[PDB]
Structures are given as C-alpha cells and as structure tokens.
Amino acid sequence: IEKERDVILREMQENDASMQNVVFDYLHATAFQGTPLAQAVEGPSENVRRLSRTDLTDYLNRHYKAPRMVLAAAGGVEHQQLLDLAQKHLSSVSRVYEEDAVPGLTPCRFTGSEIRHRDDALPLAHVAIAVEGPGWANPDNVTLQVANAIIGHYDCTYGG
Amino acid sequence: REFGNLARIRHVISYSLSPFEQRAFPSYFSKGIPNVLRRTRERILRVAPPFVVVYLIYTWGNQEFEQSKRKNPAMYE
C-alpha cells in the first residue's frame, strides 16, 4: 500500500506533465461539477495519501459483485471451455452486497461552463470544447460519430 | 497589442458558468443593500462635507443678500 502510494504519486506527477490529459480532466470537472463524473480516475493527492487498506477492501467488497462482471474472450477460444472454466473459477465471486444496499447510478447534471488554467510559459495551448452527449443507449451516437468523422482529426504529421 | 501577447500570467485558474445557467440577479436585494451601504460608508466622508459646506455657503449668501436688499432703519430722517 505504501510503496504503491509513492508509485501513484510519481505517476500523477508524470500525468500532469502530460498536457492533454490535464485538459480532459478539466473538461470533465467543469462539465460534470457537483456530480461523481467531475472527479478523475486517479483522484486527488490528499485522498491518495489518506485512504488506507480498509477503504480499499470496502470498495472491493462493494463494487466487485458478480452481476457487474463480464468475462470476455476473443480469438482461438471455445465458448464451452470458457464457460466450464468460468464455472470452475469465477463461480460465487461475491454475489452478496453484505448490507442489502445496492448503489444506484444517479444521473449527472451537465452544466455549460468554462475552466482556464493560464500558464504562459508553456509552449503550446490545449483547448477542448464540448457539449452534452446522448449516452451509450441512444441511437444518435451513430449520427454523431458520422458528424465527427466529417469534421475529423489532423496533426502536423499528416501529409495530406 | 491584441489578445495573446498582452500580459504574462502563470498558474492562474479561472472558473465561469453559462449566463443561461446562472441567475441574472442572484440575491439582488439581500446582498445588494449591504454592499451599497458599505460603499456609501466607505466613501461618504470624502464627498458629504464639501457638499454640506456648499449648502451652508449657498444659504448664507442668499440670506445675507436678502439682508443687504433689506432696508437699514438707520435712515429714519
């Protein structure tokens, strides 16, 4: 726990050394502020320093239930053999929340907003502009992906 | 000259919301009245004494002008 605490501290330093991840985290924070989607995957450094083994085991015993797990295999794999091995090993993984309190995934409020981290010593500027998307289950994702394919992507490496 | 090369600002983070998501008059009276009272208290002792002495000079000048237009009773004869 302590060695990895140092490891995530170093990796978060290297993550803020990278620049587009900072902008994506800032966009998520300013677009989903006040909701659990504002916080990044790594979490803040003070949380990294203070959370202990008990909190990790509580998270493990809360969010690693059987109905929230998919054993996905691709390639030269037989489905019958995969099913037999899942019955051998992944049978009765947790199946019990131990408190009969299933956590519900509430909607996250999107707010139109703007965050600026001005630091003029940096050589280039990273700007991300987004709006609220439809979600996974909406059929409009295909149309929005078509529009995003029309607009596209570009960098200085391209010889077009 | 234009935006981009005006100042040198580092390590400053700015937070803003949508005008269509925030109120145009957020606590307009319950916070507006104490702020106006505080500003008046801060800048009341620099303007009011000159304006009051203007009022005093105005009244004194009008009064003594009326008294100069008044008849002196020394000329009975």
CSV table of N, CA and C in Angstrom, one decimal, chain A residues 12-133:
chain,number,residue,atom,x,y,z
A,12,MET,N,1.0,10.4,-11.0
A,12,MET,CA,0.2,11.6,-11.1
A,12,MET,C,1.1,12.8,-11.5
A,13,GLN,N,2.3,12.9,-11.0
A,13,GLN,CA,3.3,13.9,-11.4
A,13,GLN,C,3.6,13.8,-12.9
A,14,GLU,N,3.8,12.6,-13.4
A,14,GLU,CA,4.0,12.4,-14.8
A,14,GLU,C,2.7,12.6,-15.6
A,15,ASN,N,1.6,12.4,-15.0
A,15,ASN,CA,0.3,12.7,-15.7
A,15,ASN,C,0.1,14.1,-15.9
A,16,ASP,N,0.4,15.0,-14.9
A,16,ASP,CA,0.2,16.4,-15.1
A,16,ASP,C,1.4,16.9,-15.9
A,17,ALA,N,2.5,16.2,-16.1
A,17,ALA,CA,3.5,16.5,-17.1
A,17,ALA,C,2.9,16.4,-18.5
A,18,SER,N,2.1,15.4,-18.7
A,18,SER,CA,1.4,15.3,-20.0
A,18,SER,C,0.3,16.4,-20.0
A,19,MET,N,-0.1,16.9,-21.1
A,19,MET,CA,-0.9,18.1,-21.2
A,19,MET,C,-2.3,17.9,-21.7
A,20,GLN,N,-2.6,16.9,-22.5
A,20,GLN,CA,-4.0,16.7,-23.0
A,20,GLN,C,-4.8,16.0,-21.9
A,21,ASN,N,-4.2,15.1,-21.1
A,21,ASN,CA,-4.9,14.5,-20.0
A,21,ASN,C,-5.4,15.5,-19.0
A,22,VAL,N,-4.6,16.6,-18.7
A,22,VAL,CA,-5.0,17.6,-17.9
A,22,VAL,C,-6.2,18.4,-18.4
A,23,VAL,N,-6.3,18.6,-19.7
A,23,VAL,CA,-7.4,19.3,-20.3
A,23,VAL,C,-8.6,18.4,-20.3
A,24,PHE,N,-8.5,17.1,-20.5
A,24,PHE,CA,-9.6,16.2,-20.5
A,24,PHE,C,-10.2,16.1,-19.0
A,25,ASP,N,-9.3,16.1,-18.0
A,25,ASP,CA,-9.8,16.1,-16.7
A,25,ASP,C,-10.4,17.4,-16.3
A,26,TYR,N,-9.9,18.5,-16.8
A,26,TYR,CA,-10.5,19.8,-16.5
A,26,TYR,C,-11.9,19.9,-17.2
A,27,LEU,N,-12.0,19.4,-18.4
A,27,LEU,CA,-13.3,19.4,-19.1
A,27,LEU,C,-14.3,18.6,-18.4
A,28,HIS,N,-13.9,17.4,-17.9
A,28,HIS,CA,-14.8,16.6,-17.1
A,28,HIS,C,-15.2,17.3,-15.8
A,29,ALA,N,-14.3,17.9,-15.2
A,29,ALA,CA,-14.6,18.6,-13.9
A,29,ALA,C,-15.6,19.7,-14.1
A,30,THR,N,-15.3,20.6,-15.1
A,30,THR,CA,-16.1,21.8,-15.3
A,30,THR,C,-17.4,21.4,-16.1
A,31,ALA,N,-17.5,20.2,-16.6
A,31,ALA,CA,-18.8,19.8,-17.3
A,31,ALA,C,-19.7,19.0,-16.4
A,32,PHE,N,-19.1,18.3,-15.4
A,32,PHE,CA,-19.9,17.5,-14.5
A,32,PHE,C,-19.6,17.9,-13.0
A,33,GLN,N,-19.4,19.2,-12.8
A,33,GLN,CA,-19.1,19.6,-11.4
A,33,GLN,C,-20.3,19.4,-10.5
A,34,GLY,N,-20.1,19.0,-9.3
A,34,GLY,CA,-21.1,18.7,-8.3
A,34,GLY,C,-21.6,17.3,-8.5
A,35,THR,N,-21.1,16.5,-9.4
A,35,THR,CA,-21.5,15.1,-9.7
A,35,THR,C,-20.3,14.2,-9.6
A,36,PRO,N,-20.5,12.9,-9.5
A,36,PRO,CA,-19.4,12.0,-9.4
A,36,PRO,C,-18.6,11.8,-10.7
A,37,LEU,N,-19.0,12.5,-11.8
A,37,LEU,CA,-18.2,12.4,-13.0
A,37,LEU,C,-17.2,13.6,-13.1
A,38,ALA,N,-17.2,14.5,-12.2
A,38,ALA,CA,-16.2,15.6,-12.2
A,38,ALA,C,-14.8,15.0,-11.8
A,39,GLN,N,-14.8,14.1,-10.8
A,39,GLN,CA,-13.5,13.6,-10.3
A,39,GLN,C,-12.9,12.7,-11.3
A,40,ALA,N,-11.5,12.7,-11.3
A,40,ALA,CA,-10.8,11.9,-12.3
A,40,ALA,C,-10.6,10.5,-11.8
A,41,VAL,N,-10.0,9.7,-12.6
A,41,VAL,CA,-9.8,8.3,-12.2
A,41,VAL,C,-8.8,8.1,-11.0
A,42,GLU,N,-7.8,9.0,-11.1
A,42,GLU,CA,-6.7,8.9,-10.0
A,42,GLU,C,-7.2,9.4,-8.7
A,43,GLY,N,-8.0,10.5,-8.7
A,43,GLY,CA,-8.4,11.1,-7.5
A,43,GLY,C,-7.4,12.1,-7.0
A,44,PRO,N,-7.7,12.9,-6.0
A,44,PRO,CA,-6.7,14.0,-5.6
A,44,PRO,C,-5.6,13.3,-4.7
A,45,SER,N,-4.5,14.1,-4.6
A,45,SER,CA,-3.3,13.6,-3.9
A,45,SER,C,-3.6,13.5,-2.4
A,46,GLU,N,-4.4,14.3,-1.9
A,46,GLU,CA,-4.7,14.2,-0.4
A,46,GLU,C,-5.5,12.9,-0.2
A,47,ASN,N,-6.4,12.5,-1.1
A,47,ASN,CA,-7.1,11.3,-1.0
A,47,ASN,C,-6.2,10.1,-1.1
A,48,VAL,N,-5.2,10.2,-2.1
A,48,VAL,CA,-4.2,9.2,-2.3
A,48,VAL,C,-3.4,9.0,-1.0
A,49,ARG,N,-3.1,10.1,-0.3
A,49,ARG,CA,-2.3,10.0,0.9
A,49,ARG,C,-3.1,9.4,2.1
A,50,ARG,N,-4.4,9.7,2.2
A,50,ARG,CA,-5.0,9.4,3.4
A,50,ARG,C,-5.8,8.1,3.4
A,51,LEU,N,-6.3,7.6,2.2
A,51,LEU,CA,-7.1,6.4,2.2
A,51,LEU,C,-6.2,5.2,2.4
A,52,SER,N,-6.7,4.2,3.2
A,52,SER,CA,-6.0,3.1,3.7
A,52,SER,C,-6.6,1.8,3.2
A,53,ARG,N,-6.1,0.7,3.8
A,53,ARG,CA,-6.5,-0.7,3.3
A,53,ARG,C,-8.0,-0.9,3.6
A,54,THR,N,-8.5,-0.4,4.6
A,54,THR,CA,-9.9,-0.6,5.0
A,54,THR,C,-10.8,0.0,3.9
A,55,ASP,N,-10.5,1.2,3.4
A,55,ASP,CA,-11.3,1.8,2.3
A,55,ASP,C,-11.2,1.0,1.0
A,56,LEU,N,-10.0,0.5,0.7
A,56,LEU,CA,-9.8,-0.3,-0.5
A,56,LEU,C,-10.6,-1.6,-0.4
A,57,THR,N,-10.6,-2.3,0.8
A,57,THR,CA,-11.4,-3.5,0.9
A,57,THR,C,-12.9,-3.2,0.9
A,58,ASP,N,-13.3,-2.1,1.4
A,58,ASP,CA,-14.7,-1.7,1.3
A,58,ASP,C,-15.1,-1.5,-0.1
A,59,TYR,N,-14.3,-0.8,-0.9
A,59,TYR,CA,-14.6,-0.7,-2.3
A,59,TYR,C,-14.6,-2.0,-3.1
A,60,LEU,N,-13.7,-2.9,-2.7
A,60,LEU,CA,-13.6,-4.2,-3.3
A,60,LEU,C,-14.9,-5.0,-3.0
A,61,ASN,N,-15.3,-5.0,-1.7
A,61,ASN,CA,-16.5,-5.7,-1.3
A,61,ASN,C,-17.8,-5.0,-1.7
A,62,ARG,N,-17.7,-3.8,-2.2
A,62,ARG,CA,-18.9,-3.2,-2.7
A,62,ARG,C,-19.1,-3.2,-4.2
A,63,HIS,N,-18.1,-3.0,-5.0
A,63,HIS,CA,-18.2,-2.8,-6.4
A,63,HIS,C,-17.8,-4.0,-7.2
A,64,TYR,N,-17.3,-5.1,-6.6
A,64,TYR,CA,-16.9,-6.3,-7.4
A,64,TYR,C,-17.9,-7.4,-7.2
A,65,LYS,N,-19.2,-7.1,-7.4
A,65,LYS,CA,-20.2,-8.2,-7.4
A,65,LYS,C,-20.2,-8.9,-8.7
A,66,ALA,N,-20.8,-10.1,-8.7
A,66,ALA,CA,-21.0,-10.9,-9.9
A,66,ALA,C,-21.8,-10.3,-11.0
A,67,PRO,N,-23.0,-9.7,-10.7
A,67,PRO,CA,-23.8,-9.1,-11.9
A,67,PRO,C,-23.1,-7.9,-12.6
A,68,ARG,N,-22.0,-7.4,-12.1
A,68,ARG,CA,-21.3,-6.3,-12.7
A,68,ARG,C,-20.0,-6.8,-13.4
A,69,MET,N,-19.8,-8.0,-13.7
A,69,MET,CA,-18.6,-8.6,-14.3
A,69,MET,C,-18.9,-9.3,-15.6
A,70,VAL,N,-18.1,-9.1,-16.6
A,70,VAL,CA,-18.1,-9.8,-17.8
A,70,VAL,C,-16.8,-10.4,-18.1
A,71,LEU,N,-16.8,-11.7,-18.3
A,71,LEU,CA,-15.6,-12.5,-18.7
A,71,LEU,C,-15.7,-12.6,-20.2
A,72,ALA,N,-14.9,-11.8,-20.9
A,72,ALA,CA,-14.9,-11.7,-22.3
A,72,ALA,C,-13.7,-12.3,-22.9
A,73,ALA,N,-13.9,-13.2,-23.9
A,73,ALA,CA,-12.7,-13.9,-24.6
A,73,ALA,C,-12.9,-13.7,-26.1
A,74,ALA,N,-11.7,-13.5,-26.7
A,74,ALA,CA,-11.7,-13.3,-28.2
A,74,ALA,C,-10.5,-14.0,-28.8
A,75,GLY,N,-10.7,-14.7,-29.9
A,75,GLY,CA,-9.7,-15.3,-30.6
A,75,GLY,C,-9.9,-16.8,-30.7
A,76,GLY,N,-8.8,-17.6,-30.6
A,76,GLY,CA,-8.9,-19.0,-30.6
A,76,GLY,C,-9.4,-19.6,-29.2
A,77,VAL,N,-10.6,-19.3,-28.9
A,77,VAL,CA,-11.2,-19.7,-27.6
A,77,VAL,C,-12.5,-20.4,-27.9
A,78,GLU,N,-12.8,-21.5,-27.2
A,78,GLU,CA,-14.0,-22.3,-27.3
A,78,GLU,C,-15.0,-21.8,-26.3
A,79,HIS,N,-16.2,-21.5,-26.6
A,79,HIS,CA,-17.2,-21.0,-25.7
A,79,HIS,C,-17.5,-22.0,-24.6
A,80,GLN,N,-17.6,-23.3,-24.9
A,80,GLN,CA,-17.9,-24.3,-24.0
A,80,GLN,C,-16.7,-24.4,-22.9
A,81,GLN,N,-15.5,-24.4,-23.4
A,81,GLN,CA,-14.4,-24.4,-22.5
A,81,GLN,C,-14.3,-23.2,-21.6
A,82,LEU,N,-14.6,-22.0,-22.2
A,82,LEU,CA,-14.6,-20.8,-21.4
A,82,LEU,C,-15.7,-20.8,-20.3
A,83,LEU,N,-16.9,-21.3,-20.7
A,83,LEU,CA,-18.0,-21.5,-19.7
A,83,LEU,C,-17.6,-22.5,-18.6
A,84,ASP,N,-17.0,-23.6,-19.0
A,84,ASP,CA,-16.6,-24.6,-18.0
A,84,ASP,C,-15.6,-24.0,-17.0
A,85,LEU,N,-14.6,-23.2,-17.6
A,85,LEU,CA,-13.6,-22.6,-16.7
A,85,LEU,C,-14.2,-21.5,-15.8
A,86,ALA,N,-15.2,-20.8,-16.4
A,86,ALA,CA,-15.9,-19.8,-15.5
A,86,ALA,C,-16.6,-20.4,-14.4
A,87,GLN,N,-17.3,-21.6,-14.7
A,87,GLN,CA,-17.9,-22.3,-13.6
A,87,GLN,C,-16.9,-22.9,-12.6
A,88,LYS,N,-15.7,-23.2,-13.1
A,88,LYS,CA,-14.7,-23.7,-12.2
A,88,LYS,C,-14.2,-22.6,-11.3
A,89,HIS,N,-13.9,-21.4,-11.8
A,89,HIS,CA,-13.1,-20.4,-11.1
A,89,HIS,C,-13.9,-19.2,-10.7
A,90,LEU,N,-14.7,-18.6,-11.6
A,90,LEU,CA,-15.4,-17.4,-11.3
A,90,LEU,C,-16.8,-17.7,-10.8
A,91,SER,N,-17.1,-18.8,-10.2
A,91,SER,CA,-18.4,-19.2,-9.6
A,91,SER,C,-18.4,-18.7,-8.2
A,92,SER,N,-19.5,-18.0,-7.8
A,92,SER,CA,-19.7,-17.4,-6.5
A,92,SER,C,-18.6,-16.4,-6.1
A,93,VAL,N,-18.4,-15.4,-7.0
A,93,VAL,CA,-17.3,-14.5,-6.8
A,93,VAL,C,-17.6,-13.6,-5.6
A,94,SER,N,-18.7,-12.8,-5.6
A,94,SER,CA,-19.2,-12.2,-4.4
A,94,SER,C,-20.6,-12.5,-4.2
A,95,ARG,N,-21.5,-12.1,-5.1
A,95,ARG,CA,-22.9,-12.4,-5.2
A,95,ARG,C,-23.7,-11.7,-4.1
A,96,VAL,N,-23.1,-11.2,-3.1
A,96,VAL,CA,-23.7,-10.6,-1.9
A,96,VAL,C,-23.1,-9.3,-1.5
A,97,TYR,N,-24.0,-8.3,-1.4
A,97,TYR,CA,-23.5,-6.9,-1.1
A,97,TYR,C,-23.2,-6.7,0.4
A,98,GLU,N,-23.5,-7.7,1.2
A,98,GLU,CA,-23.3,-7.8,2.7
A,98,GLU,C,-24.0,-6.7,3.5
A,99,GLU,N,-24.8,-5.8,2.8
A,99,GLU,CA,-25.6,-4.9,3.5
A,99,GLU,C,-27.0,-4.7,2.9
A,100,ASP,N,-27.3,-5.4,1.8
A,100,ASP,CA,-28.6,-5.3,1.1
A,100,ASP,C,-28.9,-3.9,0.7
A,101,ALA,N,-27.8,-3.2,0.3
A,101,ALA,CA,-27.9,-1.8,-0.1
A,101,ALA,C,-27.1,-1.6,-1.5
A,102,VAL,N,-27.9,-1.9,-2.6
A,102,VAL,CA,-27.3,-1.8,-3.9
A,102,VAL,C,-27.1,-0.3,-4.3
A,103,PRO,N,-25.9,0.1,-4.6
A,103,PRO,CA,-25.8,1.5,-5.0
A,103,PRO,C,-26.4,1.8,-6.4
A,104,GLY,N,-27.2,2.9,-6.4
A,104,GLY,CA,-27.8,3.3,-7.7
A,104,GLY,C,-27.0,4.4,-8.4
A,105,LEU,N,-26.9,4.3,-9.7
A,105,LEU,CA,-26.2,5.2,-10.5
A,105,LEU,C,-27.1,6.4,-10.9
A,106,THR,N,-27.0,7.5,-10.2
A,106,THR,CA,-27.9,8.6,-10.4
A,106,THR,C,-27.4,9.4,-11.7
A,107,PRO,N,-28.3,10.1,-12.4
A,107,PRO,CA,-27.8,10.9,-13.5
A,107,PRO,C,-26.9,12.0,-13.0
A,108,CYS,N,-26.0,12.4,-14.0
A,108,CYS,CA,-25.1,13.5,-13.7
A,108,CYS,C,-25.5,14.8,-14.5
A,109,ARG,N,-25.6,15.9,-13.8
A,109,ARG,CA,-26.0,17.1,-14.4
A,109,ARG,C,-24.9,17.7,-15.2
A,110,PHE,N,-25.1,18.0,-16.5
A,110,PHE,CA,-24.2,18.7,-17.3
A,110,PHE,C,-24.5,20.2,-17.2
A,111,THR,N,-23.5,21.0,-16.9
A,111,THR,CA,-23.6,22.4,-16.8
A,111,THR,C,-22.6,23.0,-17.8
A,112,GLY,N,-23.1,24.0,-18.6
A,112,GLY,CA,-22.2,24.7,-19.5
A,112,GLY,C,-21.3,25.6,-18.8
A,113,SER,N,-20.0,25.5,-18.9
A,113,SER,CA,-19.1,26.2,-18.1
A,113,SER,C,-17.7,26.3,-18.8
A,114,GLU,N,-16.8,27.0,-18.1
A,114,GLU,CA,-15.5,27.3,-18.7
A,114,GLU,C,-14.4,27.3,-17.6
A,115,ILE,N,-13.4,26.6,-17.8
A,115,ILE,CA,-12.2,26.5,-16.9
A,115,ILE,C,-11.0,26.9,-17.7
A,116,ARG,N,-10.2,27.8,-17.1
A,116,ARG,CA,-8.9,28.3,-17.7
A,116,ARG,C,-7.8,28.1,-16.8
A,117,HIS,N,-6.8,27.3,-17.2
A,117,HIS,CA,-5.5,27.2,-16.5
A,117,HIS,C,-4.5,28.0,-17.3
A,118,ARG,N,-4.4,29.3,-17.1
A,118,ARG,CA,-3.4,30.1,-17.8
A,118,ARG,C,-2.0,29.9,-17.2
A,119,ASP,N,-1.1,29.5,-18.0
A,119,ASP,CA,0.3,29.4,-17.6
A,119,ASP,C,1.1,29.8,-18.9
A,120,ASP,N,1.5,31.0,-19.1
A,120,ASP,CA,2.0,31.5,-20.3
A,120,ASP,C,3.4,30.9,-20.7
A,121,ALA,N,4.1,30.3,-19.7
A,121,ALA,CA,5.4,29.7,-20.0
A,121,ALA,C,5.3,28.4,-20.8
A,122,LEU,N,4.2,27.8,-21.0
A,122,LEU,CA,4.0,26.6,-21.8
A,122,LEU,C,4.1,26.9,-23.2
A,123,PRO,N,4.7,26.1,-24.1
A,123,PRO,CA,4.9,26.4,-25.5
A,123,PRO,C,3.7,26.5,-26.3
A,124,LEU,N,2.8,25.5,-26.1
A,124,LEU,CA,1.6,25.4,-26.9
A,124,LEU,C,0.4,25.5,-26.0
A,125,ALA,N,-0.8,25.7,-26.6
A,125,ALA,CA,-2.1,25.8,-25.9
A,125,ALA,C,-3.0,24.7,-26.3
A,126,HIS,N,-3.6,24.0,-25.3
A,126,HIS,CA,-4.6,23.0,-25.4
A,126,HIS,C,-5.9,23.5,-25.1
A,127,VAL,N,-6.9,23.4,-26.0
A,127,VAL,CA,-8.2,23.9,-25.7
A,127,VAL,C,-9.2,22.8,-26.2
A,128,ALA,N,-10.1,22.4,-25.3
A,128,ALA,CA,-11.2,21.4,-25.6
A,128,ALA,C,-12.5,22.1,-25.4
A,129,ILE,N,-13.4,22.0,-26.4
A,129,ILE,CA,-14.8,22.5,-26.3
A,129,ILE,C,-15.7,21.3,-26.6
A,130,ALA,N,-16.7,21.1,-25.7
A,130,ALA,CA,-17.6,20.0,-25.8
A,130,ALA,C,-19.0,20.4,-25.4
A,131,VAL,N,-20.0,19.6,-25.7
A,131,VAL,CA,-21.3,19.7,-25.3
A,131,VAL,C,-21.8,18.4,-24.8
A,132,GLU,N,-23.0,18.4,-24.2
A,132,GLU,CA,-23.6,17.2,-23.6
A,132,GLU,C,-23.9,16.2,-24.7
A,133,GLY,N,-23.4,14.9,-24.5
A,133,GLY,CA,-23.7,13.9,-25.4
A,133,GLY,C,-25.0,13.1,-25.0
